[PDB]
Structures are given as structure tokens and as C-alpha cells.
Amino acid sequence: ARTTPIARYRNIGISAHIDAGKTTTTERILFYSAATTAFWSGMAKQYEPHRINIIDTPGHVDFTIEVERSMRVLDGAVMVYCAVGGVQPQSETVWRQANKYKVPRIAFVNKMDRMGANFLKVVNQIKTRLGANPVPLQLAIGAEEHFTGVVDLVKMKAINWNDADQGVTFEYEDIPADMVELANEWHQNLIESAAEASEELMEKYLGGEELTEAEIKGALRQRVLNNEIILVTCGSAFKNKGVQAMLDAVIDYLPSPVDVPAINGILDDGKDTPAERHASDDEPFSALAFKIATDPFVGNLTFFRVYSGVVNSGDTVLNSVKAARERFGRIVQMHANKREEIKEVRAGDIAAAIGLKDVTTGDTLCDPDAPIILERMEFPEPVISIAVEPKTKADQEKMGLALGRLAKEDPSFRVWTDEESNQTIIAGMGELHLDIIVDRMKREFNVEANVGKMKVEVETPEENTGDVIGDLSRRRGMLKGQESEVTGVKIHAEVPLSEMFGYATQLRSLTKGRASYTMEFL
Amino acid sequence: NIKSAKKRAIQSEKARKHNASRRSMMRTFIKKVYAAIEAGDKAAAQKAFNEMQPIVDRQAAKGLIHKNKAARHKANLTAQINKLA
Amino acid sequence: MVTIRLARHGAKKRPFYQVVVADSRNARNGRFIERVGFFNPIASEKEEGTRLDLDRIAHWVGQGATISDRVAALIKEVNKAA
Amino acid sequence: VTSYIGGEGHNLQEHSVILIRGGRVKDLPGVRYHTVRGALDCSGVKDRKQARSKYGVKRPKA
Amino acid sequence: ARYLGPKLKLSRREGTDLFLKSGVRAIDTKCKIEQAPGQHGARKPRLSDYGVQLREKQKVRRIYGVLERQFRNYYKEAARLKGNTGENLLALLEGRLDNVVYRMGFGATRAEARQLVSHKAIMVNGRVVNIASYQVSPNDVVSIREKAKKQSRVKAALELAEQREKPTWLEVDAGKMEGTFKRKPERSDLSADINEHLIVELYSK
RNA sequence: AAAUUGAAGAGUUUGAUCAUGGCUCAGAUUGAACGCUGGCGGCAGGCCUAACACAUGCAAGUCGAACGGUAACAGGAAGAAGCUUGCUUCUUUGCUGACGAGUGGCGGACGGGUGAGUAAUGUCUGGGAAACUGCCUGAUGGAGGGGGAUAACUACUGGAAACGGUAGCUAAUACCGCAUAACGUCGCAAGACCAAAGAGGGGGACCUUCGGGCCUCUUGCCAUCGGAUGUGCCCAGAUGGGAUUAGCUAGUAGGUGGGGUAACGGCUCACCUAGGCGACGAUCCCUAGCUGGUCUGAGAGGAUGACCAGCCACACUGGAACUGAGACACGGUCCAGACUCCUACGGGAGGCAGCAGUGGGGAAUAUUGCACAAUGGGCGCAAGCCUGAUGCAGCCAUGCCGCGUGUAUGAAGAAGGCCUUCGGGUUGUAAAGUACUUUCAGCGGGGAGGAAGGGAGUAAAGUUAAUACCUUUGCUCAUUGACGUUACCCGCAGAAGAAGCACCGGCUAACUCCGUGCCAGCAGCCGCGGUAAUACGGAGGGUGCAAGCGUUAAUCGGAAUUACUGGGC
Numbered sequence A: 001a002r003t004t005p006i007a008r009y010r011n012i013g014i015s016a017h018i019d020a021g022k023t024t025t026t027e028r029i030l031f032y033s034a035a036t037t038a039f040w041s042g043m044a045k046q047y048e049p050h051r052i053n054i055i056d057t058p059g060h061v062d063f064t065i066e067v068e069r070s071m072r073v074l075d076g077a078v079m080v081y082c083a084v085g086g087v088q089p090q091s092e093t094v095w096r097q098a099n100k101y102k103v104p105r106i107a108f109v110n111k112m113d114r115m116g117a118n119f120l121k122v123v124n125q126i127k128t129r130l131g132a133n134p135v136p137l138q139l140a141i142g143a144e145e146h147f148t149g150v151v152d153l154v155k156m157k158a159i160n161w162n163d164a165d166q167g168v169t170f171e172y173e174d175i176p177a178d179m180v181e182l183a184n185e186w187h188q189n190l191i192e193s194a195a196e197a198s199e200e201l202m203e204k205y206l207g208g209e210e211l212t213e214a215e216i217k218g219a220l221r222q223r224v225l226n227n228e229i230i231l232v233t234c235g236s237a238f239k240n241k242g243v244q245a246m247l248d249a250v251i252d253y254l255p256s257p258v259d260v261p262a263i264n265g266i267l268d269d270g271k272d273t274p275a276e277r278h279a280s281d282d283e284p285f286s287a288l289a290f291k292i293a294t295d296p297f298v299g300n301l302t303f304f305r306v307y308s309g310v311v312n313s314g315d316t317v318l319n320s321v322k323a324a325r326e327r328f329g330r331i332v333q334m335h336a337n338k339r340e341e342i343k344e345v346r347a348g349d350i351a352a353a354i355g356l357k358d359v360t361t362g363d364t365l366c367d368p369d370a371p372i373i374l375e376r377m378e379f380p381e382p383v384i385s386i387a388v389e390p391k392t393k394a395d396q397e398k399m400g401l402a403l404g405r406l407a408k409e410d411p412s413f414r415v416w417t418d419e420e421s422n423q424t425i426i427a428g429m430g431e432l433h434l435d436i437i438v439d440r441m442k443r444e445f446n447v448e449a450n451v452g453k454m455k456v457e458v459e460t461p462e463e464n465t466g467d468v469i470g471d472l473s474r475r476r477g478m479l480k481g482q483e484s485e486v487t488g489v490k491i492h493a494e495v496p497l498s499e500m501f502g503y504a505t506q507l508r509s510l511t512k513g514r515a516s517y518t519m520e521f522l
Numbered sequence B: 001n002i003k004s005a006k007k008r009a010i011q012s013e014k015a016r017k018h019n020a021s022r023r024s025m026m027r028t029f030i031k032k033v034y035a036a037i038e039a040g041d042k043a044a045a046q047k048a049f050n051e052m053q054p055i056v057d058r059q060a061a062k063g064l065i066h067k068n069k070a071a072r073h074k075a076n077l078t079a080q081i082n083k084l085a
Numbered sequence C: 001m002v003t004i005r006l007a008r009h010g011a012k013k014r015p016f017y018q019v020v021v022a023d024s025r026n027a028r029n030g031r032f033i034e035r036v037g038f039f040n041p042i043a044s045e046k047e048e049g050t051r052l053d054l055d056r057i058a059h060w061v062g063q064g065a066t067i068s069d070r071v072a073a074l075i076k077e078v079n080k081a082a
Numbered sequence D: 001v002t003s004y005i006g007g008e009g010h011n012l013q014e015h016s017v018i019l020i021r022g023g024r025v026k027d028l029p030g031v032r033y034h035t036v037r038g039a040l041d042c043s044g045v046k047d048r049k050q051a052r053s054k055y056g057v058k059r060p061k062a
Numbered sequence E: 001a002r003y004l005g006p007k008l009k010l011s012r013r014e015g016t017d018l019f020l021k022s023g024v025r026a027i028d029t030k031c032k033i034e035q036a037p038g039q040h041g042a043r044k045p046r047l048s049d050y051g052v053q054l055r056e057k058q059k060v061r062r063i064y065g066v067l068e069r070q071f072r073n074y075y076k077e078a079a080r081l082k083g084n085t086g087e088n089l090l091a092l093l094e095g096r097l098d099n100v101v102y103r104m105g106f107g108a109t110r111a112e113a114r115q116l117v118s119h120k121a122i123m124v125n126g127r128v129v130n131i132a133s134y135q136v137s138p139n140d141v142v143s144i145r146e147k148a149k150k151q152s153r154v155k156a157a158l159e160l161a162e163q164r165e166k167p168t169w170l171e172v173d174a175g176k177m178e179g180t181f182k183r184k185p186e187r188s189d190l191s192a193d194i195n196e197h198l199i200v201e202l203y204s205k
Numbered sequence F: 001a002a003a004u005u006g007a008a009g010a011g012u013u014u015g016a017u018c019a020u021g022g023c024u025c026a027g028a029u030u031g032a033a034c035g036c037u038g039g040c041g042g043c044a045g046g047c048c049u050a051a052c053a054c055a056u057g058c059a060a061g062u063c064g065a066a067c068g069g070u071a072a073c074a075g076g077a078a079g080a081a082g083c084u085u086g087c088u089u090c091u092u093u094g095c096u097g098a099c100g101a102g103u104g105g106c107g108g109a110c111g112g113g114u115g116a117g118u119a120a121u122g123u124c125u126g127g128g129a130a131a132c133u134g135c136c137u138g139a140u141g142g143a144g145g146g147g148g149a150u151a152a153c154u155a156c157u158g159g160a161a162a163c164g165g166u167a168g169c170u171a172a173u174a175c176c177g178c179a180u181a182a183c184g185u186c187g188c189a190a191g192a193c194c195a196a197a198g199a200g201g202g203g204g205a206c207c208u209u210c211g212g213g214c215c216u217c218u219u220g221c222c223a224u225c226g227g228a229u230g231u232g233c234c235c236a237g238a239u240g241g242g243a244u245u246a247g248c249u250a251g252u253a254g255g256u257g258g259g260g261u262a263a264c265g266g267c268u269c270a271c272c273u274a275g276g277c278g279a280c281g282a283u284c285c286c287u288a289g290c291u292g293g294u295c296u297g298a299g300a301g302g303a304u305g306a307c308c309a310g311c312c313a314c315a316c317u318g319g320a321a322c323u324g325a326g327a328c329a330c331g332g333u334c335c336a337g338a339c340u341c342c343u344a345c346g347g348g349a350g351g352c353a354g355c356a357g358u359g360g361g362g363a364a365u366a367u368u369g370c371a372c373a374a375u376g377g378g379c380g381c382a383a384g385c386c387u388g389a390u391g392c393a394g395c396c397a398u399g400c401c402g403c404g405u406g407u408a409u410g411a412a413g414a415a416g417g418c419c420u421u422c423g424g425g426u427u428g429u430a431a432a433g434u435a436c437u438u439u440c441a442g443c444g445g446g447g448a449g450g451a452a453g454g455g456a457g458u459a460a461a462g463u464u465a466a467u468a469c470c471u472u473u474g475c476u477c478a479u480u481g482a483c484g485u486u487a488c489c490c491g492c493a494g495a496a497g498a499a500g501c502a503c504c505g506g507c508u509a510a511c512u513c514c515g516u517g518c519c520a521g522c523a524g525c526c527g528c529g530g531u532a533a534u535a536c537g538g539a540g541g542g543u544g545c546a547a548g549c550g551u552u553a554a555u556c557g558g559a560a561u562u563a564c565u566g567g568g569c
């Protein structure tokens, strides 16, 4: 029946800022949001083949729903970082996204193949800016271009990769005196942290003795699971280096569907254990449609991760949120774009349903009896509104269907022809977001269309106050409250509605893409 | 293609090569008889007709043409050679 | 190969076949040369749930008509030795 | 074509799409169609309580 | 598919007694059966041709508990049949199973007979029929099917089945809970007030 | 015996009338849509528009009992792996079950789809002659003998792949000559000429080169005449509208000769005649698949061709052919086009009007589903394999049918509403209360039938030469159902879980108040509303239908209103 045991299932997300390395590392993975699976036995053919479900994400603040609507389907998070920048405002964003869904994070500090790349500095950057408390799993060997491998704090070896063939024929090495002292330092600072899983580990180490790496890896995995720490690794996906050991760390610390407590559901309203459910092949079927897509080929394709249960090709299901009846014809699970039809999915899988004409994003698919709601009822608010018009005044039906389908796909992208005059206005989350929407309209549902033309409240870092207010006073903007919180400053301003027209993008370039706002008609 | 009707494509091409061979040979013998008949040598035409007759009947037997077509050839040629003198 | 087969008339979950001597090309329910008795597989007190037309079946099978599996079985059951 | 808007009160702007049926008005000379109320963003007559299927009014509780 | 309402409203709209109440006490003492059910029932409508035809047809429909669909069918047959259309129609109406149940007791009303038929409490010659429209055939039985007796309501209905014109085609057994259908009622075996020709012309209009 | 027995009017021109005359309504019907509402079951139905254009997933394979053979699994054989000469498993051997790819046979022309084209090359009805027909069947025979190859398996190369220049080849029921064949072909005659293939099962022998030979039977092969079937062809009648389409036609009509076809034929070529069709509508133009039938009608007739069945036609568009018994071929070939996809840039690959499904268009039409258990169909000795045929399941009140949503009782004729002549009436036995029942839904348990067969064993004969081996016909044995938590049956609880839609001026069944004031609004027709509106809106009441109701659209009727039946100037 089940091809791979549930314990040999990793549901990992690759989320970071922009161009931090996400897609590159994902390609190195396929060698050694787009959901895609792989079979990574191990680095030494150990760890009988695991099935790692990887959900590659965007890092743009425009597509923040495309990552938050996968965070609460994922079980683990692989937060990528660049080595020259480390924590960016975009990195802080997806970080808060993952903290909202309490994902057990590890980190992967990519771009050690660049000048100015550092590892210690980026670890401390994470510890200071975000708030995480990181345990360095690796330590780079080779500063910027000399980067050849890393040292482990468990194996105490050097995995210096062979650069003749891309990154596969790595060698294990003698961890030489290039860095063999800081290695010891951080190895001890790792042991001292893995001791933080039980009193019987305090008594274990405090005997003046270093415990065994087996029960150190188990302990650190416990810590990641309880979100107590975060394990950071070190690689270079572009120089084909460090990726396979990040995959090892994924196998060794990230959770399987059973390494967590059950998923708590709701029977008809909030009950004591209303529909708490655990990942098992024998449960009643329950899932969560984390993504709606618009198939180029079909125009409809629903992603879902089965939490508890086993559904089949043809099984009827209950839209417990919508209180309706859904059925199955084609189930496809494959790489980012390809589609390999299968027959049934078990708990812990991620597949694409078809003909699912009713379920919207975040709505729970389940058998006629399973949870009425499964959490996930919150996604952001559009921040940018523009109007639009096709080349011929009368193709507005084509345009309305295109922008009803794309709006179904992106719940953070509205459309409503405001009945003030008649104008069909489009509300996305970013300038590039709306560019993407318009070009998808021109390309998929081909209609060439040219775009056109309160008490605000803003938060921002307490360094860009002068400019944002200069910008607010630059606009016809009177203000309300000069109050500063603690992680920033809350600005309140009364500005026109025919105005600001791009205030989000003006604000993002102005605030270092680290500010939010709201403008709801005083 | 899609199915293994490509096998039948190969076989049809091969059979076309062979049938074209044999039909060309047969039609050539009949061209010989017709050139004799338009030459007028009732005896040379007779030899040519007796040369083609087993060929065309053997082909009809093989199925390359029909019994009726072979018999039609033989009847036309007998009529011609008999009026040929 | 002129067959003599059952033609599957009736209703859903309640069949009623008609023994039809038809060219084996045409569809089951489709074109047929002649019908020789019926067959009702769901009878309790009806006309045996079967009736054939044996002189015409014999005429056909003398003309070389092939008899299907169930129609052979029905000739068996009609011939009271089976 | 011209088409009546039956009932009491509508919301029809110039770009609203509506469903058109048959049935003239007999005193508007040249109007031979009726706007199907309660279909295609042409909402049904507010505060109707009798013949609500016509004028597309969902059953109040009352 | 069943008129769940005030039966006496129907009866006094017809003016006559359509028996939808157990004829055990009275008709006037339960409902003021001379005036139409409205607040304008004291008034008098003229009752033109179509009025009297519809009113007779509705009287029959309300007596037998049949709805307009399947009453059109009870006319379509008995128009297809041979003989008098209206007589064949009244016969096809007396053949209904709740009809013969009522006329043989086991329920003081056609609606009680409907519940009797429907709750699998009846057995036309042993075979449990529960289709209240089952057109019972002559020379057949009704067999009230033990565990459906001595519920005291079939007993009360058997007791109250007297004081009523005894059907010339039934031969009930009153406690043995058998009852036959020896032959279909002819014309004169019924109320004789029901002008079946009115209904025939209503449906052939 | 019965196969019918069937024909209704109303409103509206007028101050009123009678006619003429149109409009409108009452009916039946629908592949329906929309609004409101919606419990169940059964049986049906379901892209009417874009023959728009399609991604993928399946829709045609099968035979090892034709052959060469061994890629995969298994059985074994030899082990000096594993080892306690092994049960604790090393490789070679097609040897055997078997089987990837390959040669070969049969199928792939069926079944499934759509109605674009097609006004007659089509269809329907009824005849006819100038024909061919795989598989199926009957009759008579033959089934000697031999060669060269040729795929796979592979020498020199190409090619991302598809898949080619040469070769080394080796088989066959692949191909080829010969011998032989006449009630077969040609020929008036004489006469000349034409085919084939073998495979399997066991066995008394008895012979070997453990190849087998040999005797049998089971199939298969070749020829001819038959049947059945299927198909091709011809003819006559009929099968739309437009004459605001009257001339059209030059292979055109025919004749002769050659050629072609399975077959007759201007089918075709070359001559020759100058004919041929046309007011019975030729020609052109628009539209259209046709039929049984479906709706309607008392009929005659009108409209229609969804389902189902027969015929035709098409397969992305245009053309041609090849193989074959059968095609000018949905899931084959080639070319030209448009389109789409793949590419390493060098090249290719495809055609959902198959089943789902999709964009789109539209008022509007479903499941990228489960089985081949039934019945069929291809292959096969069978077993079996395959079948998006077919059987079932899903969705949707789309239709028809059936059932339920309680039954009896109940006068303080309650409260409340509404009307009121202020008495009261109506709501209304209606509710409540009391008694009883639990259909269906919901739980729980039992449980037909669609299942015939097939296979293994057995016996009897037929069988031979042999109790073998094959049939055939009984006996036993284990069994085969997707539907399926089947139908149906039994128990559990309690009236709980189940009623809405339109209408109420006349046609037309069913009335009052209030608020409104030619406004807002209604209206199928006539018409209503400008201060006492049963016509609008609400309320109370009532009428009809009911899990539907109404609206719109469409057909016939009514309409004797295209009048043939059956009208008028």
C-alpha cells in the first residue's frame, strides 16, 4: 500500500528573501509556490530513501500569500539566507509568517561563494534582528571564493566537496587547522544547547563528559520540534556545495507528520477535542486545500495536504467549511509544472485535485464526517488598487472572467467594478504583483488591457519617520498621532483617496520594504 | 504513431514494394503482347501471349490481381491476336 | 460468421435478452436478421424465463450460423435432458 | 433592444449585464422584452412579499 | 403529496359531507358546514358552469384523497378503457387500496386507511402492499397482518364501520381481519350524488 | 373475442346589433432556461450554440499450438557461494513453464462519435442484372519436391530521438520457381495455363543420429462449385423554398473501337453523329442529412428527426493512394496548409465530431469515475488477454411515475391576526391538549437474483490399430458479481427529519381592509390606478397545483384563420 512509511516523509518549505538562493538550492536538490517531491536516501546511501516534499516559494512581498498559504500546510521550514546580507526585511517577513504558524525552522545560509560572505556574522544577524537562537550545525571552510566545504559539530569532519563533477562526489576530510579551534568552540556551544532537552541531559553533561552524537541529534531534533532552537547550515548552491548536508539536516531535525502532536480540528463549533486528528493511513479522510491554481491546460487545479485519512481517485469529499459535496477524477502529484496522475494519497502527502469546482484556498476537504474547519482563516489585505480597460471597450466580459478566475486563484487579489461610475478596479499587493496579473491576463486569457487610475495608519522602522512624513506632508496629508511603539513607530495620517495612488510602492522603496499601512475611509 | 498500427505501416509498405514489383512485371509482359499486336506478328504475338498467360494467372492466384482481371486480360489478348492476322 | 446471440433489452438491473440471429459485425442491440425466441433471466413463474424458436435456429445453423455460449446453454436448458 | 424593468425600484447602470426575456409592455410602443429580475446582477425588487418568484425575491421569514 | 390541512374546511366548501372526519359524532357539531371557509363564506358565489364542474371534480378528489396528477391519470385510464368513462373512473377510484381498506374498516377515515396501507400494516393476499393507490383486483383479499391488530385503532374503526352503508362488494370478516373484493362496484353501488359526467366534461374540455 | 367510441368554446371593434375580420386565452407537448422553493425512491434524460480548438489519462489488441529466440520471473540440471555433501541458494544450460522485443497470421474497415458536407452520387418504397465476399457452412479432391533470402540476433557508420547507408547472417504457416490439378481460366473447338503450410496431443509397436522417424486423431493450408452473409451497381416513384432563379449542357446525349473495373456504365481515351435536359420547373440561389418514428390533431393535416433503431456522410482543412475479402481508412501512409507541442537547434511529433475532461461561446447541458461479473466484439485449441463497447455508479426536480411530510380526537369554537353593522364573524378542530401508528429518511442486523459458465477429477460410449489423446454427454469438487453497506426482510426511537409556488376585476375557481393617489406601479387580451382600487403594494382570508410552482421560449390545436376533408370575391 503505502510506498514510503510516514516517518520517512518530510514536508519542507524553502522560504527566504529574494534571490537568497531558494530556487537554486531546489535545483541542486533535484540534482543530488512550486511543490515538488524528491527521494533523498542519504549522503552515504544511508537513511533508506526518504520522500521529501519540497514547496519552493516566492520571496517577493507582492507574493506573500503564495508563501503564507503554504506555511500552514508545511511541517518544517528551511529558511534560506544570503551570506553577505543575511537577514533582510523580506527575510523578517517570511520569518513572521512562519512564527504565525509555529513551524519548526532550520536555516541554510547560502551564498558563501560571494565576496563579503560570512557565517558567524549572519548567525549573529539572525540572533539580533529576528530573535531566533541559532545552533550552528556547520561552519564554513573557505571565506568567499576559497569556500570548499564545512565542518560538522557532530561528525567533526570536513565534507569538502569535489568541484570536478558538480557537487556529488564530496570527500570526508581531516578537518585541518584552517579552522580546527573555532570548530571545537562551536561544537561545545552546540553540545551545551542540546543538553537543553531534559534534566537528565543536564545531569548527563554536568558529569564533565560529552554525550554521544546519536542522543545529541535526537535531542536537537526535539528542540527544533518544540521550536526551542534553529539549526543553521552552510552551503553554496551556485558553486554546487553544501546542499546535500542541508538535506541531511532536513532528514535529521525537521519533523515527519508523526513527530508532532495531532492536528486539532472542529466538529461543528469549538469543542474540547472536537476533531483532533493524527496523521494515519486508517483515519477518516481530512485534508486542507492550501492552494488553488489555474491550470493552463484546464483552468482549475487544487493543491492539498492530507492531514488525517486516505482519499482515492473518485472518492466523494465534504467541503466542511463550505458544507457541500466534492468528488475526485484526476489526482496529480509531480514536479513544479509536470503532473503525474496517481490513484490515491495517504496522510502526509501533497497532491493536486481536479474538477474541484467549489473549494477555495484554505478550505478543508474531508470525508462526510471530518472537521467543519481546520484553522487557516487569515490572509493579508490588498494594498494597491488600479483600474483596467481592454483594447476594445466590449471585451470586458472576457476581462471580468479572467479577473474572476485569477481572483479565485489569489485570495489576496480582489476585483470589483466599483459602482461609483462603472470602473473595473483591481486590488493586488504590489506593483510587480499587478504586473504579473496583467501579463497573465494577456497571455493565458488573452486580452490586452492597459491599466490606469481617510485615516491612514502606518508602521515603519524608527529611522524612516522623517522621510515617510515628508512623503505624507508631500501628499495632502494631515496627521493624527505622533506615537512610537517599541519595534518601530505608528504613524497616523489623514490623506485624500484620489491620492497616493501608489503609496505602497512609494512606501516600500522609502521604508526599505519594511512597512505596512491601511487607508479605510475616515 | 500511437498504437502498434505502425507495424501494419511497415508491412503495408513492404507489401507495396513487392506488389509493385510483380504488377510491373506482369504489366510489362502485357506491354510486350500489345507491342506485338500493334506490330502485327500473329506468331510473335502468340508467343508473347503464351509467355504472359502463366504470369498473369499465377498473379491472380497470388491475389495481386483478381481472377476476373486475369481472365479479362486473356480474353482481350485472344480477341486481339485472333483479329491480328 | 452469422451469430445467434442475446440482445440485452430490458431495464437497469433487470435485463431481458432476445435471441437474435445477427451478423457478428453489427452491435449487440443493433441490426439483426431475425429473432428466434427471447430469454428472461429473472423469472420465477413466467414462461420459463426462456423461449426459443428451434426450427428456425436449426435452419440457420444448417446455413452455418454460429451459436453463442449462452444461446447454446439455452438450447441445452430447452432440451429437457439438461 | 429596449426592455422593461418590471417591479418597483432597480439598480441598472449603463454597463450592468442583465437577463432579457420576452413579454411586451403594451403601452410602451416598441418594447417587447422584459428584464429578468433577480438574475445577473439585476437584483430583485426589494420589499416584495407576493409573487416573489417573479421579481426574484428570496423567501422572507415572516 | 397529501393534503395535510383542515378537512372540515374542504367539506363545508363542498357544503356536503365528504367524511374526512370519522362519522362518529356529527358534522355540524364539529364544523359549521353550511358556509364556505372564508370570512366571505356567508356570502354566495354564483357558481357558473366551470364553477360547478371544478367543484364536483374537487369533491371527488377530496373524498378519495387523490391529487390532480394521478387524478388526470385515473381519467386517462377509463378514457382509454371500455364502457362509461365516469363509471370506469369511479371504479378505478374504488379500486384504490386505501379505499377498500376504509370501506372494510381498519380505519375510520381515508387518511387513517392511508396510514394503514403505508405503514406495512396491510397484506393484499399475504404480500405486504403499502402503495395507497394499489388498484385492488377483484377476487382478492386484504389480510390486516398480525402486529397491526389490537392496536385498538383498527378495533375502533371496525366498530365504527357500522352505522354505515354496508358495501355490496366486500365481505369483511371483522376480527378475523380478512376482507375480499368479490367484484368491482357498478354504478348504482355508490353515493349517486356524484355526477361523474361533470368530471368527464371538465377533463374533456 | 379487443385491437377503439370520436369533433366544446371564451374575451376583444359598437351607445347597442348582426356579420366579416385579426389579436388573445383555456389543452397537450419539450433534450428546456430563469425566479422562488425543494424530502425520498424507481425509470429515463442531459452541449439544441463554436464540425470552435484541444493538454494529458484511457478508447485495439491477441496468438509461444507459425518461427527464429531468451530480455524479465519461475521450475528444474552441475556445483568447489551460502555450507550441518545444501532446506541454511554461487553461476552456465531455452532444457521447461513461460515471456520483452522481432518475423508472421488475424483483427485494426467492427464497435464508439458527430451531422459539417449533401436537395440527390443521399434516403424511403418496390423491382432488377452486368458482380465480388475475410471469418461461418456443405460437396469433391490436393496437400510431391526445392531454392534464395530476411527481421530479430548482429561486422563498417549515421541519428537528441525517431531511425537510415551498406552489410555477417539465421528461421517460419514470410517469399519464389518447379512438379501436379480439372465440373477451374482463356478458347467455338482443339488446346494452353494456375496452388498449397504446416502445427499440436498422446501411443501398441519397431526402428535411433535421444533429432526423431512411425500409427493415429485434433486443428491448420490450396482449388473449384454451393449456401448464408455482407457489399457494389441500375431503375421507377416519392422525398424542401425561391420564376424578385428560363434557359442549361460540350464528355455534354448517344454510336463504334481500344482501355479500366470484382462488375454494367463516358468510367475512360480516339473518332462520329448533334444530340440531351427544360414551364411535370431544367439551370442557379438559400436552406437541409434521410427514414422508422416524436409532438399535436376526431381526422385529414401541421410541426419535427433529442433519446432508440436502419441507411448515408465526415474524421483538423485540401488531394492521392497503398495494404487488404472489405478503406480511398477517428485513434494508419504520403503530400500542401493552418495550428500546437518537444529540441541538445542538428531535427522531429500530433489531430477528443471515442470516453471522461478543458478553454471558449451560450439562457443552457454531467463523472480526467468502477468492472469487464452479464451480454456482445477482436485474437486464440483453449485457458485467457483487451474493449471509455456494454453493464453499473456519480451530478443535476430535466422529465414521467410512486410515496412521505402523520392518523383519530379536541370547543375554553383559546390566545393572536383580520374584518365588523361593534352584536359578532373568520382564522378554526385549525392550534394546543389526549390517544395511536413509524411508510420513507436515520441507526443495527439478515439477505435473493442478475451466474450462464469455465476449470480440476470422474465414467460412458464415439475414436484409433490402442482402456491412451481428443472430442461430445452425464456424475462429484472447489469456485467466478463491478454494482454492493444490492433489492427485499427484521428490529430500535419518537410525530420527530421533510411544503412550497402562483393566483383571486372578466375571460377564470377564488374578497375584504389598509396605503396609495393617471404617482408608484400591474397587464396573456380587455384594461386598472387622477381620494372609498376586490386590477398596484402590504395584510387577513380564499382558490388551484403540489416537491413542485410560475415566468419566458418553442410546436400543434382551438384557427373552417390557406378551408383536400373544410372558406370566400
Ligand SMILES: Nc1nc2c(ncn2[C@@H]2O[C@H](COP(=O)(O)OP(=O)(O)O)[C@@H](O)[C@H]2O)c(=O)[nH]1
Residues within 6 Å of the ligand: A017, A018, A019, A020, A021, A022, A023, A024, A059, A110, A111, A112, A113, A114, A236, A237, A238, A239
Ligand atoms: N554567486 C552566486 N550566485 C548565485 C548563488 N545561488 C544563486 N545564484 C544566482 O542567483 C540568480 C537568481 O537566483 P534565483 O535562483 O532565481 O533565487 P530567487 O531570488 O529565490 O528566485 C541565478 O542566476 C544564480 O546564478 C550562489 O551561491 N552564488
